[PDB]
Amino acid sequence: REGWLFGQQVQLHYHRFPDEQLITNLSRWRTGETVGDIAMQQFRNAQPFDIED
């Protein structure tokens, strides 16, 4: 089993699910550390480029 591009065994991503940033940062989130937080907004759902011809 191979990906077409470079022959990877997985489909590439950074993030997948809606909660993972929250669930990972949870005690921060209850704390309220995350209120104005721009790192959990900007890149939360960010995925790789399409590197393809």
């Binding site: 809606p18 909660d19 940033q21 929250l22 989130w29 995350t34 937080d37 959990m40 907004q41 939360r44």
Partner: protein, 81 residues
Amino acid sequence: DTSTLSPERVALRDELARKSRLVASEGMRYYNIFWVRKPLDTMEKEYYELKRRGVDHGEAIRKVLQGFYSGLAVKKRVAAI
């Protein structure tokens, strides 16, 4: 995994969201809050609404966006008052 979104829909709500980031962010800033209605959807709904009353593409878009912005205007006026 297959997008339930047909490419036309993609073009539409993506374009809506590139014209304003507030509309995109609204329901989901951090994690997705999925039991609340979201502006992106509401606006798509009244977009199709406009279209079937014969309003064209561009005008319908700027009109819906104006709707959201004037609502937001009300809100933040109250905030200041």
